[PDB]
Design a protein around this ligand. Sequence first.
Ligand SMILES: COc1cc(C)cc2oc(=O)cc(CP(=O)(O)O)c12
Ligand SMILES: [Zn+2]
Ligand SMILES: [Zn+2]
Length: 229
Amino acid sequence: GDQRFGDLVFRQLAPNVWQHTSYLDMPGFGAVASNGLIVRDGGRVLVVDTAWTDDQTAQILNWIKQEINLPVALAVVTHAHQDKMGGMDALHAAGIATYANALSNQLAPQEGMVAAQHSLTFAANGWVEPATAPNFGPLKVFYPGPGHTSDNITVGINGTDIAFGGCLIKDSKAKSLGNLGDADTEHYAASARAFGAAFPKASMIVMSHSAPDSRAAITHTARMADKLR
Ligand SMILES: COc1cc(C)cc2oc(=O)cc(CP(=O)(O)O)c12
Ligand SMILES: [Zn+2]
Ligand SMILES: [Zn+2]
């Protein structure tokens, strides 16, 4: 299932969909894995999230060149923290168009991130305003409300059973919601449930820090979040 490629790991989840995994030795927390996605849409490739670093993100592009060998049309990043946005410069060096929540781009400088080139905005119900996500193919971008951070966004893959929760969603056996230092404790539970309701047919839930799981990842994350209120 897992393919080791240098210091990174890649796993095919479905036809046209792979999970990328990178690791950073965070002092006091061990070597933390972070997951994103790679999607083939016809003759082009779409990326969800960078790796932790520019060098690791360049390695993602190298793997894409070896295993898919099609241009990367765009990347979308799911919030302004290092595990999701730390490799923005590598995407720009490669000529890839980059997208993030407008709020992520506003927060990026003070968070130590490089902003994406383009800003997504969202309707009151959470769905991306379509003009701000042009040519996204099967990617369906949804802002579920504040949770892990105020700017966290999520992505479904049309034509598959897959939806991606980023750092908002933890697996069905997770012991806690992890670092809540930037989190919205009042709204987390509703935001997790809003993600599940936005993608009701997704039976494979992908997330930043655990392997793909069933929808019990959503119910368990929300149930743990109920206790924050
Ligand atoms: C940004 O990421 C992290 C940073 C640091 C310094 C420690 C961490 O320790 C963990 O065990 C999990 C993460 C990922 P998270 O902040 O939950 O998105 C992590
Ligand atoms: Zn974060
Ligand atoms: Zn994370």
